[PDB]
Amino acid sequence: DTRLLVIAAPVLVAASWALFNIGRLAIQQIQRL
Amino acid sequence: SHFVPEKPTYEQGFILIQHLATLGYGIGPGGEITSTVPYFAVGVIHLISS
Amino acid sequence: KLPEAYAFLNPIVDVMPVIPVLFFLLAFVWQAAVSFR
Amino acid sequence: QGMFVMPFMTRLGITDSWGGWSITGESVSNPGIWSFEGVALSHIILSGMCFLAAIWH
Amino acid sequence: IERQVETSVSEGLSESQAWSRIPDKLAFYDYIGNNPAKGGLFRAGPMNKGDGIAEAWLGHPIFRDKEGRELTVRRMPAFFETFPVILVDKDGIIRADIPFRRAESKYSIEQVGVTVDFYGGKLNGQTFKDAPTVKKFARKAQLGEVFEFDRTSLESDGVFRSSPRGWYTY
Amino acid sequence: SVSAATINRARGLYGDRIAALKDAVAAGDFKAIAEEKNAFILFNSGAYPTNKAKKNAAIAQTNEIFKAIRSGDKAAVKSAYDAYMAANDIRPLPEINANIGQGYSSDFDFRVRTKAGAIYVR
Amino acid sequence: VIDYENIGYLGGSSIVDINNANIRAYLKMPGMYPTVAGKIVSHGPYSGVSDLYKIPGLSSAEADVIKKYESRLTAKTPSPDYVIDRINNGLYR
Amino acid sequence: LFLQGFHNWTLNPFHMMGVAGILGGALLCAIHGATVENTLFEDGDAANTFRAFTPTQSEETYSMVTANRFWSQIFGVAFSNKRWLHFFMLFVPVTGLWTSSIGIVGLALNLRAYDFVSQELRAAEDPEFETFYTKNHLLDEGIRAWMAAQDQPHENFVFPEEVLPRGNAL
Amino acid sequence: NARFANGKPQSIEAKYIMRSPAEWDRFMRFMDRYAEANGLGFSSXXXXXXX
Amino acid sequence: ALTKSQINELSYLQVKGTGLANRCAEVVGEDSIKPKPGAKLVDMCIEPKAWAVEEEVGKAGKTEKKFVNSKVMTRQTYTLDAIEGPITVDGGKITFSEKEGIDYAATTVQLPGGERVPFLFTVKDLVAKGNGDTFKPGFQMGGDFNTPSYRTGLFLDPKGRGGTTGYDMAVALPALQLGEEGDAELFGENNKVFDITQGRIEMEVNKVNAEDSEIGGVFVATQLSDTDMGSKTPKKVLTKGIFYAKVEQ
Amino acid sequence: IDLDEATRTVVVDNAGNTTVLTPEQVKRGKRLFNATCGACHVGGITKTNPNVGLDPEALSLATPRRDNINALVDYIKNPTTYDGLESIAEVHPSIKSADIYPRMRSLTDEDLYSIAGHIMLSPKIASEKWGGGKIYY
Amino acid sequence: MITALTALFVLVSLALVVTVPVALATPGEWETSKDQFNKIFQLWVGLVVAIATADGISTAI
Amino acid sequence: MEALVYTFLLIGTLMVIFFAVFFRETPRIL
Amino acid sequence: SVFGLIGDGTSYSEGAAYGTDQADKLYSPYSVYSPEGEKSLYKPDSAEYLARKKAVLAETKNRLQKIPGYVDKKEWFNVKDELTRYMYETRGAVRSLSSSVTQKEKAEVFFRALEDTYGAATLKKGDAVKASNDKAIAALDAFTATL
Ligand code: CLA
Ligand code: CLA
Ligand code: CLA
Ligand SMILES: CC(C)=CCC/C(C)=C/CC/C(C)=C/CC/C(C)=C/CC/C(C)=C/CC/C(C)=C/CC/C(C)=C/CC/C(C)=C/CC/C(C)=C/CC1=CC(=O)C(C)=C(C)C1=O
Ligand SMILES: CCCCCCCCCCCCCCCC(=O)OC[C@H](COP(=O)(O)OC[C@@H](O)CO)OC(=O)CCCCCCCCCCCCCCC
Numbered sequence A: 001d002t003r004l005l006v007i008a009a010p011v012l013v014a015a016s017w018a019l020f021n022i023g024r025l026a027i028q029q030i031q032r033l
Numbered sequence B: 001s002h003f004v005p006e007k008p009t010y011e012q013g014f015i016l017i018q019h020l021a022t023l024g025y026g027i028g029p030g031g032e033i034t035s036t037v038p039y040f041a042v043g044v045i046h047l048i049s050s
Numbered sequence C: 001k002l003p004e005a006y007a008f009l010n011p012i013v014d015v016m017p018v019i020p021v022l023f024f025l026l027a028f029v030w031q032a033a034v035s036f037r
Numbered sequence D: 001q002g003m004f005v006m007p008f009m010t011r012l013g014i015t016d017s018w019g020g021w022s023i024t025g026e027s028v029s030n031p032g033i034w035s036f037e038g039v040a041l042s043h044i045i046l047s048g049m050c051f052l053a054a055i056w057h
Numbered sequence E: 001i002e003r004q005v006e007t008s009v010s011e012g013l014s015e016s017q018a019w020s021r022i023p024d025k026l027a028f029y030d031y032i033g034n035n036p037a038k039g040g041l042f043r044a045g046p047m048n049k050g051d052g053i054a055e056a057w058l059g060h061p062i063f064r065d066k067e068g069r070e071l072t073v074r075r076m077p078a079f080f081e082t083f084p085v086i087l088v089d090k091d092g093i094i095r096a097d098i099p100f101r102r103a104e105s106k107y108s109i110e111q112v113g114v115t116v117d118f119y120g121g122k123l124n125g126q127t128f129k130d131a132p133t134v135k136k137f138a139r140k141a142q143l144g145e146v147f148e149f150d151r152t153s154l155e156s157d158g159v160f161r162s163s164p165r166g167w168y169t170y
Numbered sequence F: 001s002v003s004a005a006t007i008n009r010a011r012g013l014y015g016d017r018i019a020a021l022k023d024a025v026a027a028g029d030f031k032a033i034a035e036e037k038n039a040f041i042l043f044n045s046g047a048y049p050t051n052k053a054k055k056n057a058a059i060a061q062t063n064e065i066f067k068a069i070r071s072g073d074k075a076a077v078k079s080a081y082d083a084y085m086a087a088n089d090i091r092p093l094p095e096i097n098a099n100i101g102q103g104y105s106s107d108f109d110f111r112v113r114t115k116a117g118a119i120y121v122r
Numbered sequence G: 001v002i003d004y005e006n007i008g009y010l011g012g013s014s015i016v017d018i019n020n021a022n023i024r025a026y027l028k029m030p031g032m033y034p035t036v037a038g039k040i041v042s043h044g045p046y047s048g049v050s051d052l053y054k055i056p057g058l059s060s061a062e063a064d065v066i067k068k069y070e071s072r073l074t075a076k077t078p079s080p081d082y083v084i085d086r087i088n089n090g091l092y093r
Numbered sequence H: 001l002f003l004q005g006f007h008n009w010t011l012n013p014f015h016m017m018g019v020a021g022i023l024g025g026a027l028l029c030a031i032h033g034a035t036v037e038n039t040l041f042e043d044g045d046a047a048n049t050f051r052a053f054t055p056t057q058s059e060e061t062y063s064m065v066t067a068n069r070f071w072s073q074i075f076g077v078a079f080s081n082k083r084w085l086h087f088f089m090l091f092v093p094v095t096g097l098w099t100s101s102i103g104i105v106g107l108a109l110n111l112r113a114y115d116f117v118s119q120e121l122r123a124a125e126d127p128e129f130e131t132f133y134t135k136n137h138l139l140d141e142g143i144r145a146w147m148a149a150q151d152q153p154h155e156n157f158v159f160p161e162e163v164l165p166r167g168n169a170l
Numbered sequence I: 001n002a003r004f005a006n007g008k009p010q011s012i013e014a015k016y017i018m019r020s021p022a023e024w025d026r027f028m029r030f031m032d033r034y035a036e037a038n039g040l041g042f043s044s045x046x047x048x049x050x051x
Numbered sequence J: 001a002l003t004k005s006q007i008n009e010l011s012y013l014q015v016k017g018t019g020l021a022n023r024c025a026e027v028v029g030e031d032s033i034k035p036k037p038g039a040k041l042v043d044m045c046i047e048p049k050a051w052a053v054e055e056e057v058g059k060a061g062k063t064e065k066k067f068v069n070s071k072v073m074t075r076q077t078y079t080l081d082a083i084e085g086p087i088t089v090d091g092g093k094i095t096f097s098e099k100e101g102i103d104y105a106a107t108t109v110q111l112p113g114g115e116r117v118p119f120l121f122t123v124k125d126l127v128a129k130g131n132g133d134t135f136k137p138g139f140q141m142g143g144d145f146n147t148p149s150y151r152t153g154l155f156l157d158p159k160g161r162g163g164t165t166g167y168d169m170a171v172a173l174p175a176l177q178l179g180e181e182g183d184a185e186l187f188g189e190n191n192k193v194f195d196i197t198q199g200r201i202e203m204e205v206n207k208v209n210a211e212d213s214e215i216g217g218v219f220v221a222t223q224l225s226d227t228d229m230g231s232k233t234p235k236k237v238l239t240k241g242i243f244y245a246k247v248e249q
Numbered sequence K: 001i002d003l004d005e006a007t008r009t010v011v012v013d014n015a016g017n018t019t020v021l022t023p024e025q026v027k028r029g030k031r032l033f034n035a036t037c038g039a040c041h042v043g044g045i046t047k048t049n050p051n052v053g054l055d056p057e058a059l060s061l062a063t064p065r066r067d068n069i070n071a072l073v074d075y076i077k078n079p080t081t082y083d084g085l086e087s088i089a090e091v092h093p094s095i096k097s098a099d100i101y102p103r104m105r106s107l108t109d110e111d112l113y114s115i116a117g118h119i120m121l122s123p124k125i126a127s128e129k130w131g132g133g134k135i136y137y
Numbered sequence L: 001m002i003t004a005l006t007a008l009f010v011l012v013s014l015a016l017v018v019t020v021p022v023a024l025a026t027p028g029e030w031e032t033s034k035d036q037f038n039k040i041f042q043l044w045v046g047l048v049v050a051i052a053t054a055d056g057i058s059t060a061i
Numbered sequence M: 001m002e003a004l005v006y007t008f009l010l011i012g013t014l015m016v017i018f019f020a021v022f023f024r025e026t027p028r029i030l
Numbered sequence N: 001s002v003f004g005l006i007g008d009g010t011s012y013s014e015g016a017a018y019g020t021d022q023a024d025k026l027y028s029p030y031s032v033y034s035p036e037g038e039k040s041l042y043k044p045d046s047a048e049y050l051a052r053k054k055a056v057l058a059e060t061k062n063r064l065q066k067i068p069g070y071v072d073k074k075e076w077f078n079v080k081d082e083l084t085r086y087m088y089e090t091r092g093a094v095r096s097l098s099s100s101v102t103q104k105e106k107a108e109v110f111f112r113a114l115e116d117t118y119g120a121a122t123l124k125k126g127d128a129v130k131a132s133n134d135k136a137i138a139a140l141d142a143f144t145a146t147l
Helices: A003-028 B017-019 B036-048 C006-015 C019-033 D006-010 D036-056 E002-009 E023-030 E131-140 E164-168 F003-017 F022-027 F029-033 F039-045 F052-071 F072-087 G023-027 G060-068 H002-007 H013-038 H064-074 H082-108 H117-125 H132-151 I016-025 I027-032 J186-189 K023-037 K070-077 K109-125 L002-024 L034-057 M002-022 N050-067 N076-082 N088-098 N101-122 N126-145
Strands: E053-057 E061-066 E087-089 E094-097 E116-117 E147-151 J042-057 J063-072 J080-086 J106-112 J116-119 J142-144 J146-148 J196-198 J200-202 J204-208 J214-223 J234-248 K009-010 K016-019
Touching: A003 C006, A003 C019, A003 L002, C006 L002, D006 D036, E002 F039, E023 E053, E116 E131, F003 F039, F003 F072, F022 F072, F029 F052, F039 F052, F052 F072, F072 N076, H002 H132, H013 H082, I016 I027, J042 J106, J042 J214, J063 J106, J116 J146, J196 J214, J204 N126, J214 K109, K009 K109, K023 K109, K070 K109, L002 L034, N050 N088, N050 N126, N076 N101, N088 N101, N101 N126
Parallel strands: none
Antiparallel strands: E053 E147, E061 E116, E087 E094, J042 J063, J042 J080, J042 J234, J106 J116, J142 J200, J146 J196, J200 J214, J204 J214, J214 J234, K009 K016
16 A cells, blocks of 8 residues: 555645635634634 | 655756755765755754744 | 655655645635635 | 949049959958948938938928 | 550550550649649749640659569659659569668668669660669659650749649639 | 558558468368458458449459358359459568568558568668 | 769678778677777778788787678778768767 | 648748738737726726726726827827727738638648749759758758658658658757 | 956956046036035935925 | 967966967977987977968959968867877988878858858878978978868758768759759759868978977968869968977987 | 567577566566666667667677677676677776766666566567667657 | 654644634734743744754764 | 849838838827 | 556556556665665675775876976966866765775865865965875875775
C-alpha cells in the first residue's frame, strides 16, 4: 500500500478544510468579518 | 524532501537550494552536496518565524 | 529526503508549498461570505 | 551614358561619390558632405523645406 | 496509355512500335504543366508562357537496373512545387533515387547503375547508360510525359501555369 | 481520391494475402479459403478501382474460385487459382536488403514490420 | 559537382574509398573506428591500399585490421571537396 | 503549417489584408475601449466609476470633444463621429475575414502567390544573391519534404534519408 | 572601444567637455527660473502650486 | 603592438576588447640565430596592414591594370596566428615548410565602386626559400602556397545547391528541363566545382632578437580572390603587412 | 498486442542465449535509463558522440560485440572505446568512474541488468525510431 | 522522541491556525479568552525550544 | 526600373498621410 | 468485453502508473520521489579509487613546481591557468582523502596558501606568488605525509 498517497491526499483535505472553516465558523458566530 | 543525492541540484528542478548553496551551506567541492541538514535548518526557521 | 526523524511527515511537507496560493483563494471566499460588499 | 544632371555637378567641382569612386579616375577614402549623393540629398532637403515654407505663406 | 500498349503487345507487336502507336495528344494530357492546379495567381498569361510551345513527344522512358527489372520514377502530386527523384519498381520499393546529401547515399544512380531506354517518339530506341543523362531524364520523367518545347518564341520562363479550367472556377 | 499509391497499397497489402494461400491450396484447406473471402473482395476493389473492365474480369475470376470449392474438385480449384494469379499478377513481397531495399520510411507505411520492411539507417 | 562517379564507394556499397570517404564510413568495419580510421583519415592522398601501410606511426596491431579489410579498401583519385570533410562530414546521428 | 509549406500562405496578399483586419480589429477594440473609459464624466463621488451609469440616460458618459482633442493632438488624426466610428469598428474585422476568405478559395484550386518569378530568376543566375524571401523557400521545402511522409500516410511516401533536404549538422 | 567597459561610455576628455557643458547649459536655463527662490513647503497631496 | 614579453604580462580580461589580439608582436635588435637541424618556427603571427585588389583603372587617356588600396569589411578577423612548420636547410638556404596553425582568414574587402571582394588570406601548404642562411637584417623568404576554395562543398547556394550536396537542378523553375536540352544554360552554375589555386608570398626579415630567439619583418603577399564555385572570375588580391615568429633550436 | 514473454525475450550471452525480462524490470529499465543515461541517450543516440550510438546495428559492430545483456553490463563496469583497446572510464560514467560520477554510486546488479535490458528491448519495440535520429521523431 | 513531539506540535498548531483568527475577528472573544491563548502560545514556543534541543542533542549524540 | 514604382508608391502614401494630418477638415462644435 | 487496466494508484500497475514504490517491489528506494536504492550495494567507496586520488596529489606537486618558472618569465595568466587546469581535481581529492581533524587542518592551511597565490597572481606581485607557493608546497608535502 502506498501510504504516501494515502497520507498526501488527506493532508490536502485537512489543509483545504481548515482555513475554509474559518470562513464557516466566523459566519455561524456571526461577528465582524 | 525531494532531494536525491545522485543527481545535481539543477537536474532535480530545485530553486532555493542553490541560493543557500552559494552562501556555503552543506556544499563541498565541485558543487557536490555534503548534506541537506543546514538546508533543513534554514527552511524550518522560516516556518516558525512566519 | 528529510532527516530520519522528520521522514514520517513527508506528505505533510508535500502540501506545504501550495498553501500560499490557497490564502489568495480565501480572499475571494471571504468576499462571497460578506457577499461582495 | 545619357547623364544630363551629372555634368553640371562635376563642372563646378563635385568629383567624388560615397561609393568610393571618383570621376577623375581616382580613389577617395572620404568625399565628405559634398558628393554626388550629398548634393542630390541637399536638394531634397531644400525641396522639403521650401515645400513647408510654401504652405506657410 | 498502358491499356493501349497492352492491347498492342497482345496483338503481337514488339515494344518500340507498341509505344509509337500511342497518339501524341493523349500523351500531352498525362503531363503536369497541363494541370489547372499547377500554376499560381500572379503567373499571368497562357500556359505557353509557362514552359513553351510543345513541339513533339520525346519518348517513354523505361528505367532498368542491373537485374533487368523496371523502375518508374514516382510522379509528383499536384501539391508539391518540388518533389525529389525516387525510382521505384513494380511493388513500390526504392531501388534508386537522386541524393540530396551525396556522402553516404546507398541508392544513387551511379551506384545502382540505372540504365535508360526509350520507346517511341523522336527518341525511339536509344539506350542511355551515361550516368548524368540517366539522372537528367530521371528528373524530366518525374513530371509528365516528357516532351521537347520551344522556350525562345515568347521568352517563356521555366515554370508552370494554369488552364481556363483553373481560371474560370477561380 | 483513387490514386496510384492507393492501387499500390491494396496490391501490396493483399497481394501478400492472396499468394500466401498457396500453402492452403496444397492440403485443400476449405475453411482457410472461406476465412479469406474478404481478401479476394478487397484486392478486387483496390487493385482496379478506376478500371471497371478488369475489375469485372476479376469478379468472375473470384467467383470461379468459390464455385469450384463449393463442389470440391481440388484439381479445378488450383486450375482456377493459377489463372487468378497469372491474370492479375499476384505477387507477395520478398525479402529486401540494404542495396535492394528501403520498404518504409515513415511508420505510417503499409510495409513497416513486413519482410520487405527495412531501412538503411546510416 | 553534380556528378561524381565514386558515390557508391563513399558510404554506400561494401567497398569504401580511402581518399574521400569520411571517418564515419569506417564505422561498419569492426575494430577500426578509433585510432585506425583516425590515422587513415588524418593523413595524405594515397596510391593504393598497399601504400596505406607507409603512414608514419602505423604499427603492427594497427595494421592487422587493415590487412583484414584490405579487400574492402580501395584508392580513387581525390576530389578535394571530399577531402576537407574527412574528419567531420557535417552529418551526425 | 500545412498551408505554409505547401502553399506559401503568409505571402498571399489576400491573407495580408486579413491579418490587417484582425489585428486592426483588435486595435480598435483596444482604442475605443480605452478612450471611452478615460474621457468619462464625473457622475458620482465614488472612486469606482462603473456604478455611476444607468442605461436610461439622455446624456453622454464620455466627452467626445475631449476624446477628439486627445488623438488629434497625440496621433494627429482622430474621429469626430460616433456613427462613423462604430461603423468603422464594424467594418475592419469583418472585411479582414472576407478578403482572407477570398484567398483561401485561391488555394482550393491551387492558384496561389507562391513565388515571385524575377526574384527567383536572379537567384538561379547569381549564387551570391540571397533575400529573406529565398530563406523562406528553403524553410518551405523543409516543411514539404519532412512532413509529407507522415502528413499523407495513404500516398505511401518512402523517403530515403539522403533524399531528405537538410542543412549542415541539423 | 566596443566593450572596452567604460564609465557612461566614453574614451576621451573631449566628451567630458560635452557631457558636463550640455547638462550645465540646459541646466543654467533651468536655474534662471528657479534661482534665488527656496523654502515654502506646502503639506498637501502634490500641490507644489507655487509660481 | 609591443613585444611578446609584455603582451604575456597582460591577463586575458584586460586584453579583451582592446584590439590587441590581432597585433603581431615586435622585435627590438639586430642579431643572427643560425637554426639547427631539428628546430622550427612556432608562433608565426602574420598581419596584413594594407590590402590591394587588381582592377581596370582610369587615368590620363589610357586604361590598364593596377591595385587600389581597399578597405576591410570584416572587423578584426583577418590575421593569422600560431602557425608552425619544421625548418630545414639543404643547399645552404633555409626553408620553412608550413604545416599547422590558423592558416586562413576569411576576409572580405570592398572595392572603390561598391564591389565586395571576399577571399581567404591563407598560408596553407607553404614552402619558403631563404636568400641564404643565419636569420639576419635582410634575410628574405619567399614561396608558393595553396589558396583552397573559400566555401567548401558543404556550403550551399541560396536555392539549395552545393558541391558535395544540394540539389543539382534549378528547384526554382521545374519546367526548365523538358526536352533534349535540359537546364544546360545553367550547367555552369548548377555545377559547384571545388577549385584550388596557388598564391605567392615574399617575407623580408627586418629585426631579429636571439635572446628570445624571435624574428620579425615585413611580407608582401599576392593571391587570388574567391570564385563562387566557378561562377565569377576571381580578382588578384595583394596584401602587405608585418610578420613575426619565434625560433626553436 | 501486449508486452508478452516473446517481445521481452532478449539476447543475454554472446551465444544465442535468451532470457525474458520480468515486466517490473522493463519499468525499472525505462525509468533508470532516462534518469542516468537519458541526458545523452534520448532515443538511442549519443549527443556527445553521434557516430557511436545505441543501435543494435552499431552495438554488433563494436569490439567486443555489445549486442547482448552481459557485455552491456560489462561496458558499464568497464567502458572501452568502440574498438575496445583502451578504457574511457576517465570520461564516461561507469563503476570504475563512480567516484567521479555521483549518479552511479547507488546502482546494483539488478539495476544494470535492467538498464541494459532496456537498451536491448527497445529496438524490438521501435526498430527504426531507436537511434534513428531526428528523422524518426 | 522527536517524531512524537512534532506530531503534537502539528496538532496544537491546527487549533492555533483555526481558533485564533476566529477569536481575533470576534469583537468580544479576545479580551476574555486572551489568557487561554497566552497559555497555548507560551506552550507552543516552549515546544519549539524543546524540539530544537532534541535535534541538537540527537544529531551530535 | 520597378524600384521607381516602389519608391513612388511608398513616398506616395507618405505624402497622402502628410495632407491627412495637417490639411484635414477640422471638426467644429457649432 | 474489456475491463481495461484501471490502475487507480492503489490498484494494479504495469507500465504507466506512478505509484512511487509499488513496481519497485521491496528494493526500497532512497526516498519515494526517486527510483534508485539508497547506498548499500555494488559500490564499496573504500575500494581502489585511491589510486586516482593519490595520483592527483602526485601530479599536484609537479604543477606547483611550474609556478616560479612562470613568474620570472612574467606570465601571469599561466600562473592563474595552471592553478586551475590540472589543479581542479585537488579539492575533490584532498577533501575526499582527509579523514581526521588533523588532516582537515592541514588541508585548511594548504587551501589558504593556495588561494593567496591566485590572489597575488591577480594582483601581479611576483614576490608574493613565490612566497605563497613555498607556503603551499610545504603544506602539500606535510599533508601527503600525514596518511
Ligand atoms: C544653396 C544654393 C544652391 C547651391 C549652391 C546649388 C548648387 C547646385 N545646383 Mg542647385 N538649386 C538651388 C540651390 C542651390 N543649388 C535652388 C534653390 C534650386 C531651385 C530653384 C536649385 C535648382 C537646381 C536645378 C534644377 C539644378 C541645380 C543644379 C545644381 C548644381 C550645378 C550648379 C550649376 O551648374 O549651376 C548653373 C547655374 C546657372 C548657370 C545660373 C546662372 C545664373 C543666371 C544666368 C544669372 C542671370 C540673371 C542674373 C540676375 C543677371 C544679373 C546680375 C548681373 C548684373 C551680375 C550645383 C551642384 C543642377 C544639377 O546638376 O542638379 C544637381 C540642376 O540641374 N540646382
Ligand atoms: C472571370 C474573369 C476572367 C477570367 C477567368 C479570365 C481568364 C483569362 N484571361 Mg482574361 N479578361 C477578363 C476576364 C477574365 N479572363 C476581362 C474582364 C478582361 C478585360 C480587362 C480580360 C482581359 C484579358 C487579357 C488582355 C488577357 C487575359 C488573359 C487571360 C488568361 C490568363 C489569366 C491571367 O493572366 O490572369 C491574370 C490574373 C491576375 C493578374 C490576378 C489578379 C488578382 C486579383 C484580380 C487582384 C485584384 C485586386 C486588386 C485590388 C487589383 C487592383 C490593383 C492595385 C494595384 C490597385 C485566362 C484564360 C491573357 C491571355 O493570354 O488571354 C489570351 C491576356 O493576355 N484576359
Ligand atoms: C500573426 C498574426 C496573424 C493574424 C492576425 C492572422 C489572422 C488570420 N488568419 Mg492567419 N496565419 C498566420 C498569422 C496570422 N494570421 C501565420 C503565420 C500563418 C501560417 C502560414 C497563418 C495561417 C493561417 C491559415 C492557414 C488560416 C489563417 C486564417 C486567418 C484568419 C482567421 C479567421 C478566423 O478568425 O477564423 C476563426 C473561425 C471562424 C470565424 C469560424 C467560427 C464559426 C463559429 C462562430 C464557431 C463558434 C461556434 C461555437 C462558439 C463553438 C463552441 C466550442 C468552442 C468554444 C470550444 C485571420 C485573417 C484563416 C483564413 O484566412 O481563412 C479565412 C486560415 O484558414 N491563418
Ligand atoms: C521607405 C518605407 C516607408 C518603406 C515602407 C515599406 C513597407 C514595409 C511598406 C508597408 C506598406 C503597408 C502599409 C503595407 C500593409 C498593407 C496592408 C496589409 C493593407 C491592408 C489593406 C486593406 C484595405 C485591408 C482591409 C482591412 C482593413 C480595412 C484594414 C483597416 C486597417 C486600418 C486602417 C485600421 C485603423 C486602425 C487605426 C490605427 C485606428 C486608430 C483610430 C484612432 C486614431 C482612434 C481614435 C479615437 C478613438 C475613440 O474611441 C474616440 C472616441 C475618438 C474620438 C478617437 O479619436
Ligand atoms: C507624432 C505623430 C506620429 C503620427 C503622425 C502621422 C500618423 C497619422 C496617420 C494618418 C493617416 C491616415 C488618415 C487617413 C484618413 C483620415 O483622414 O481620417 C480622418 C478621420 C476623421 O473622420 P471623422 O470622424 O471626421 O469622420 C467624418 C465621417 O463622417 C466621414 O463621413 O479619422 C478617422 O476616422 C480615424 C483615422 C484612423 C487613422 C487611420 C490610420 C491608417 C494608417 C495608415 C497606414 C499607413 C500607410 C503607410 C504606408 C507607408
